[PDB]
RNA sequence: UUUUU
């Protein structure tokens, strides 16, 4: 008495013209990563374009970017990846402090800069645990949110990506800090258009006329 | 979706 193996498909199906459109053979093997089909982060083409833009502006090569990306990621952990950031971002070269401009780093991000840094969310999460083994390390973003749980330091930056299995109680904490940080976020599409209104005067000026025009139909 | 500095 062998054991039968069950496999179910079809059932309802779209059936646009009497036959199914879904390729169930391909659907069985089509199991991509959740972050590869999410619209909350930049695509591979957009991320690749951003990478070359930073190279052409800073002038460093591939090995230089590897060092810079580590410093930039740490800076983005402490300081949020807001589109309004300006000035320079700093990294420690052993003992001295070196600064790099922020403006060229924001120009080549086709989507918002937070989507670009979302690609570093998995690496950034591992960085916090590496720091939180012998010392209490809390990112400045988590300090500004008044998060009193040091165990939930893995999730203390604004470019963190939610996962199906990685967070269990951190989902509630991460969303609460997002709501607190976005309590007074204005959303205006337009504002201060480039037109200055005013008007245009098209009238000839002659010595025989007055400041504006001649006087007619006036008696006295 | 964005908006978290």
Numbering used by the authors: 91 to 310
Relevant lines from the article:
The structures of SPFMV and SPMMV were determined using single particle cryoEM with helical symmetry, at resolutions of 2.6 Å (SPFMV) and 3.0 Å (SPMMV). Each subunit is separated by helical rises of 3.97 Å and 3.98 Å and helical twists of 41.2° and 40.83°, respectively, for SPFMV and SPMMV. Coat proteins from both structures contain three domains; an N-terminal domain made up of 1–123 (SPFMV), 1–111 (SPMMV) residues, a core domain with residues 124–276 (SPFMV), 112–262 (SPMMV) and a C-terminal tail comprising 277–316 (SPFMV), 263–305 (SPMMV) residues. The cryoEM density allowed residues 91–310 (SPFMV) and residues 66–296 (SPMMV) to be modelled, identifying the major components of the three domains in each CP structure. The core domain consists of nine α-helices (SPFMV) and two β-strands, a feature which appears to be conserved amongst other viruses in the Potyviridae family. Interestingly, the predicted structure for SPFMV CP showed a largely un-structured N-terminus, supported by the high b factor in this region and suggested reduced accuracy in prediction in this region. The RNA segments are bound to an inner RNA binding pocket, formed by residues from the core domain and the C-terminal segment of the coat protein. In the sweet potato virus structures, these correspond to Arg 235, Ser 172 and Asp 248 (SPFMV), and Arg 262, Ser 152 and Asp 236 (SPMMV) respectively. The transition temperatures were calculated after data normalization using the first derivative of a native fraction for each sample, and the results showed that SPFMV-VLPs dissociated at 55 °C (Tm1), while the CP units unfolded at 66 °C (Tm2), whilst SPMMV-VLPs dissociated at 60 °C (Tm1), with unfolding of CP units at 69 °C (Tm2). Whereas SPMMV VLPs were readily purified and maintained integrity during long-term storage at low temperatures (4 °C), this was not the case for SPFMV VLPs, where particles were apparently easily disassembled and/or degraded, likely contributing to the much poorer purification yields.
Sweet potato feathery mottle virus (SPFMV) and Sweet potato mild mottle virus (SPMMV) are members of the genera Potyvirus and Ipomovirus, family Potyviridae, sharing Ipomoea batatas as common host, but transmitted, respectively, by aphids and whiteflies. A common feature for all potyvirids is the structure of virions as non-enveloped, flexible rod-shaped particles, composed of multiple copies of a unique coat protein (CP) helically arranged around the RNA genome. Here we report the generation of virus-like particles (VLPs) by transient expression of the CPs of SPFMV and SPMMV in the presence of a replicating RNA in Nicotiana benthamiana. Analysis of the purified VLPs by cryo-electron microscopy, gave structures with resolutions of 2.6 and 3.0 Å, respectively, showing a similar left-handed helical arrangement of 8.8 CP subunits per turn with the C-terminus at the inner surface and a binding pocket for the encapsidated ssRNA.
